[model samples]
Target: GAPIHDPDFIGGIGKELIVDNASDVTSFYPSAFQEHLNFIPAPTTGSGCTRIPSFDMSATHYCYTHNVILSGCRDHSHSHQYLALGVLRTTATGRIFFSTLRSISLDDTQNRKSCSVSATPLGCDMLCSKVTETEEEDYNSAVPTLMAHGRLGFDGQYHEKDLDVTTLFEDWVANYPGVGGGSFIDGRVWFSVYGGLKPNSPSDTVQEGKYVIYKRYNDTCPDEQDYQIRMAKSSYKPGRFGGKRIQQAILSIKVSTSLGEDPVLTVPPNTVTLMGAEGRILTVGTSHFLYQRGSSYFSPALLYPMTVSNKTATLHSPYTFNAFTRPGSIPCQASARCPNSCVTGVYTDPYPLIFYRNHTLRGVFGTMLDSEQARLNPASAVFDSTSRSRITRVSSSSTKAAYTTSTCFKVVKTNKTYCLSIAEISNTLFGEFRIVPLLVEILKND
Candidate 1:
């Protein structure tokens, strides 16, 4: 008769068999590493007690110690031939356990071998199947820590203290090297600069800068203080993108500045740069805020400069200052106004520039204050959900076509509205679920 499918195998003769071979019984289940669990049983007299390294105690220090048993089957007899059994435990201490087991067959004198077991002993409690010890090591050194939000600086010479166009732009471009210039009618290196008491705010000051008579090239760092700075002055030829060649200037962000500050670049305002566009591309900025207050870091800012024409754009030093000073308060906030401490700049372009009109990019950037409000206080949502979709739709439509310029000033005209929006997003959501017209153009052209 077939055996009963009883739920309780307890106290049954066959229950002991299932309990003894629990590990083997588990082979019927699905596992990712099931292929590696081929257990073969065979007798060998030539090699005697075969030596095999215990893989369980190899690299990882498992929390539970296990028992390993060596047994031999009776040759057509009901007698049990227990070969050897050993216990193993893991420990940081120097105490070790070593033993040798050998089988002596009465009838077969030639069939003899020795088995050895070695491990660190946990304690006197031999019946305890598992021995676990608390792991201790300073993880502060073991784990890589993220840079604080908005805590970015750069090391570029201040072209002007009041405007600080070069300094501001150098800091911004240091983070966004991929942004290209020449979106304006005149082929010039162009990018944006950010200014605010807070890291990123719509009301935050947004300004434009251009690379003029600058060299573009790759640079490498030799030490904290020393590094090679490559310069690629804007070339008067079309730049390389897809198979089509267009005049463009590029410089890797690795170039170190002679200035002392550890420069960080970010997309200006709250916008991200788009692909195949001739303006500052917007993307996520730094993760943590620039400061740590009460052991808490928040309100990360993203910084980057624009690239145009020959990776250099020039603004009359005057306009640069005005760009920063004109907008003193957080643009998005009603209570804030342009700060008196701001600088102003003015520039007149040499040629008519065609800037993008149909496109507007938006992002978020916050100061330590914004982070405090967001972290400590609760809001219905980051913004009205409708505002998000409106912005998303705008971004989706205009992120292509280099976002041609609408106005041409004395200085090189680089589109900055997109970057302004991206910066407002706090760089957290840049490049994620967004579109860039410049990128789209590049893809289409390709």
Candidate 2:
């Protein structure tokens, strides 16, 4: 459990959450068209978040701000369900719950096509360099307001004062000559900013929310940050499960940051579920136009509020600091199309897409630099749950060679050892569950 000094990576990222892909990179702004650069700027105490010209990119401080306690559902008959996560515990007299620990088993699968004997296609990046962390728990340290978590997905997390985003996407195609069409954003442009999880019932499914990232303190005085998100006054538990040909149960989370500190603020040490039996959406990029992502921002807890005098830290309710508000206008159209009608809708997710690896992808995909030493490296693909009947089909017998790595298990009564990533997983629909992306790295390796 050690060996990996300074690393962070990027491979396939589409809408790292820049106001939901800002219509594919702001139409090369010229006359401030529809003023849709999308939020940013707010902080004034010792200056912490600042950058304008219409919420630039680089996500100011790398976006992400969730606080939902629990929200996940959609059942044609998984018998309803809840508690997508756990680990909170507080009761010296304040009261707080959580210990349920993971639950979303829609009866999981070994059928939709294949991946369920507890898959392992390449043991998730071949256990990226001896997976260290003699344990570093932060799960947003026992509540102070609501909930929070970090390193919101893009896969291949990065760090080191983050900022290299491929030379800022080649200096934005040479300072906006046609904005990402002049070369259409080359690589490593991962963005951030999230909010989307709704079933909104007293207990029907979702609705405890949070989502804000505008930070623009200068238009008239913009930078107005305050999105720690807290609105769960409904109280928890119970719904059991039920019903038919149903249609929804979406889920989404956001926040990003790495190294230089613990996985900072609030619970979430694991979670990547990707199963996509064709609810459509999931394509990262090697280029030819693939960039879909699951889509969700329906409300973000009713957006509006952020202009704190620029400090940090606060409570359950009382946050307010507009002080100069100004970033929305509409009254000058000579037919450039886009006069309005934007902010559309269409958020449906519920075939599984949940993400929350919460930081730690050092030096990108780690190993394999021309096979650079380490005993000249060559032994990661463990096995031993009695070798599961010599593994169920898909052969090569050197054990794992469909891609060159990933196939661990070792669990002799919890001596615990993991990794089952049939290599980054897949299935763009077609044959549906297409081996449900090898049991989603078989539950991200337990």
Candidate 3:
């Protein structure tokens, strides 16, 4: 039924609008009462199956017509339960066959099942003959119908084919009208199950079980690979579903490289500091190193000259080679620098030339967030006792930081305060015999 809009419901801002509309006089006359009549209570005891009786025609036609009607009803209800919509069909060999949709409800809880069956009757000479039945079960109530079917393949083989009933259910609902009768709109179709037209039995309407139409495709990774990997962290609070719902986070690492180029190394989020060669430290979000040649260096070269505020200095060589020995020895005789005779024929150099420097030094560090710890053990977290097994729960509480480099200057002064420093040096040189204040002025030469 189409909903009517109120005329006083004006178009726009800062104004009160009326939303009430008068109900249609004939809105609930026939259909509402018809739906109430359709509520059929399931039978308590029997074979859990029943036959549809058609007085004037073969049971095949009778079952087919009723199946079309029931399929439409199911599409309208979208009921949170499993249902099998079976129709009788004849093959070219004049053999009778019943096709079932093996339908499942879309509700999250109702989508799983513990047991199921697929049955096909052999003799069509009569409606109530011995039918071939194949049964399956999860052995526990924890598993839903759809998941149960996933464990047992559609053909009941050893995980040969896994089925996704959601798409099948949707397609069945969409194509309901093509089978027979009028086009079925969702809310319009309604039926009662108390009378003669009910197909299988009252138990069919209420008994919960799984079923399958036919086998189609095989699953590539049937068991363990179906689950998604998740990382979770625990905090004290009431959970959403019931107890505590552990908060989870997804961590993604993407490494990509173009043709003939080295792959870029992407660090996982929440890195604070990285240790480099020779006690060198690189602080994230506060470091910048210059690129030399085709590679970026984290620490500047020792011999490079640096200037700050009109003061310039260069780091001396940091390596020393063999340079000191007695005269007639290998290194000294070769260079002819020592003034003593060598004892051994080999000119053995005893000492080497050394280079030294002094500069501000900073220590390695970390943030307060890095103090917390995390661990994940999949084998310990049992998902289910039976068919469904262990599921890994990864836990962590680390925060992600942006990648960056530190300043080039060893000591940084900010806001009249020395930001970073290790030691300071001061020296004064005065000319001898400066008894009186003397000012020297020299003429400028062009």
Candidate 4:
């Protein structure tokens, strides 16, 4: 099994090697796929009153798991869709170099798994903890044969059918900076690199982002109808590929069947019923969130606390807060999880999502390949409907740029290319500017 030997993978060339004896790496097997991040609950048909699943990133607790999946997901496919579910932990290590996987065809002879097992380099920004570290508990998977240093990436070779192997995913790296990347980060655990690619590509098997993931759900809807709802804000027109639009995906439905062994009424997305007490979860812009359950439903919560990239073990989630000027609009109630109530209240954010610089300026927050044809709104250029009723897909100004090594800006577009750092962006761009009317509008509002 010759994994890839290309030294210049993610951070490449100048990157220093790291050795961590406690991480495992691999692709998602057919049995238990792993990549799903910051998920919002889907709307349930019949009754929209039931609660949906939600993920809260608490720096005080380990909240990283297979909870959220907005789009670019699938079950029986190889490539373009499984970036988030790839990961592992390890225990055996001593003297080690890096080994890249170049092949993975067990029966067909050419569908190589292509993983890179290496003495993780310093430049990689992945983050996943191990079993010995505790907190991660039952969702944690490990292997005795693999050894890692500092950080690791997920991408490996395995039977496409299904078999847990002591393997790893591709040499990983993410492009997200301010959210969770840079100086104090570790590249050992695959989950550590759970950030996303900007103009995301399906051929990219190593990177992780909400744009590509394994949904924390089973799509076997009630009647076997392939009910697919389109998200409008994709990078494509009626465009395609997931950018911020993935955050607005919904999947709540109720189905009943009389089993010979046990008659049961079930919620399609698995945990929707049991976790319904917590109500539905919604994303305010991109970084913040709103919980539609209990006393704290509707207010925004700081899920990805400040401690995210500083240390893997260091993370926290404070009590929810009211960040907006006025109370938010409450969409519905938590009474739809049972036999008769219909789950309602799932709504879309009508405003433009908060602007993320990297996703707007670089290619990391890229596009996922779409097999289905995209449709545009009748009156507008948006890929999906901007209707406030269904999952809102308001077109955002977020489109990925070229893949860059850092947050370098190609300023002024008089096209003489120059890489500008963070410090330069504000001062350089605003060197000689106009005091626009927007400023006056803000002052008047406040």
TM-score of each: 0.17, 0.17, 0.14, 0.21
Candidate 2 C-alpha lDDT tens digits along 264-355: 11111001111101111111121111111111111110111111111111112111111211111121111111111111211111111111
| Candidate 1 wrong stretches, greater than 4 Å | 1-307, 313-334, 338-357, 362-375, 378-446
Give the alpha carbon lDDT tens digit for every residue of 1-446 in model 1. Answer: 11111212112111001112122211211111101111112223321221211111101010111111223222112121112212222124421221212112112211211111111111100000010111111111222111111100111111111112244332221111111111111221112222111113221234121112211112122223211111111111112211111111121121122211232233322112111111222111111011001110101111223322233322221101101110112221211221111111111011111111321112221111221112211011111101210111222222211111111111012111111011111112322111111100000000
Q: Local distance difference test, per candidate?
A: 0.16, 0.16, 0.15, 0.17
- Residue 424 lDDT, candidate 3, scale 0-100: 9
Candidate closer to the true structure by lDDT (higher is better), 2 or 3: 2
User: What is the lDDT for 84 in model 4?
Assistant: 15
Q: Which lDDT value does model 1 have at 141?
A: 20
Residue 417 of model 4: what lDDT?
15
Per-residue lDDT for 311-331 in model 3, tens only? 111121121111111112232
The candidate that wins on lDDT is 4
The TM-score of predicted model 2 comes to: 0.17
What TM-score does candidate 4 get on C-alpha atoms? 0.21
